[PDB]
């Protein structure tokens, strides 16, 4: 399946992401440097923050308590569609999913 990562500056990168792989992992594996992924994907650092395009927000499983707690301390603007992309696990239902990457993580 495909994920599209839109950088703060509007640059768009399209990745092939396998089932079961997190959107943070795919970003970090392929040089999407505006996703840091510092804690390695356990909703412990908030450096994999993204804005999920509203076309997909009713397709992605909802954020759990932990993710909601961790999201409180993102350094870019917290938005209704803010997610930690380490918590978004690719599946065929999400093919085409677009996420926007904020201008900061740390």
């Amino acid at each position: 399946s495909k994920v599209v990562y839109v950088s703060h500056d509007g640059t768009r990168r399209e990745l092939d992401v396998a089932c079961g792989v997190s959107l943070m992992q795919a970003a970090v594996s392929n040089g999407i440097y505006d996703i840091v992924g510092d804690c390695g994907g356990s909703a412990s650092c908030a450096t994999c923050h993204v804005y999920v395009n509203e076309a997909f927000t009713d397709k992605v499983p909802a954020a759990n308590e932990r993710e909601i707690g961790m999201l409180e301390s993102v350094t870019a603007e917290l938005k209704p569609n803010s997610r930690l992309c380490c918590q978004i696990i690719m599946t065929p239902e999400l093919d085409g999913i677009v996420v926007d990457v904020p201008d900061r993580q740390w």
């Binding site: 079961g20 510092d38 804690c39 390695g40 356990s42 412990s44 650092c45």
Partner: peptide, 15 residues
């Protein structure tokens, strides 16, 4: 499905 915590886990996972 290789699962491990060889670099640790949580906020201290190996920097």
């Amino acid at each position: 499905c290789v699962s491990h915590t060889t670099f640790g886990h949580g906020s201290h996972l190996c920097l």
